[PDB]
Amino acid sequence: LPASFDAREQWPQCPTIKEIRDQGSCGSCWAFGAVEAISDRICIHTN
């Protein structure tokens, strides 16, 4: 494996990888890590 990796570079065609969200005043961080990584992977594996 390379000594460094940043998915934002490996997959520039997937804007969501660079995208940061805001959970607000709510303990939903559990759902944020999920939908973010899922948005990335949908693009990486297809569109």
């Binding site: 940043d6 998915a7 804007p15 940061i20 805001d22 005043s25 759902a31 944020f32 999920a34 949908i42």
Partner: protein, 205 residues
């Protein structure tokens, strides 16, 4: 440009299985719901992008900005199985399902391979008082009192001045830390970062 998956949809419609909405949840269960029930599109607060944009306004997470400060944890919004008006097609048609979900072994080597092969993963770590004050560099807990768990998205790794790290994205907006991202110590299960990693494969393929 691709599909922005709705935090709202998962947070509000998962239910018991996932935990207690705005008051805590289980990421492994979240990924599992995606496989079973799927998830619709949905952008950021007030964006009108997607089927179900986030409905909780943004705020200043322990930093100073112009936005109102965050006020702990409010009410989990309800589950509305309908898309916003002005969006097509329907909610059922708008669902995106995961093929499978799985934990990733507690090996930095195994987490690294996963990201490299399949993309960014979700993990969890323990937030100490000194984490809030992060601006840049590589985070390494020194002082502070345990505050609670935090689920994030790990999207890479590297080395900054001999110090190995994980490139991690937080969900505290852009004005927190390094443009919303942060690096945290890698290879020692520091603050339990390598111990709770979960991921899955899109049904699309």
């Amino acid at each position: 440009v691709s599909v922005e998956v709705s935090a709202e949809d998962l947070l509000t419609c998962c239910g018991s299985m996932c935990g207690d909405g705005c008051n805590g949840g289980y990421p492994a269960e979240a990924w599992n719901f995606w496989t079973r029930k799927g998830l619709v599109s949905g952008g950021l607060y007030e964006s009108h992008v997607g089927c179900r944009p986030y409905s909780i306004p943004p705020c200043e997470h322990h930093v100073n900005g112009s936005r109102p400060p965050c006020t702990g944890e409010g009410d989990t919004p309800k589950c509305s199985k309908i898309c916003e008006p002005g969006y097509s097609p329907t909610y059922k048609q708008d669902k995106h399902y995961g093929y499978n979900s799985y934990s990733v072994s507690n090996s930095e080597k195994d987490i690294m391979a996963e990201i490299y092969k399949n993309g960014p993963v979700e993990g969890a770590f323990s937030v100490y008082s000194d984490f809030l004050l992060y601006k840049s560099g590589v985070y390494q807990h020194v002082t502070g009192e345990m505050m609670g768990g935090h689920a994030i998205r790990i999207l890479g790794w590297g080395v900054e001045n001999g110090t190995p790290y994980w490139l991690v994205a937080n969900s505290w907006n852009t004005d927190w830390g390094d443009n919303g991202f942060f690096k945290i110590l890698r290879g020692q299960d520091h603050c339990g970062i390598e111990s709770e990693v979960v991921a899955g494969i899109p049904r699309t393929d």
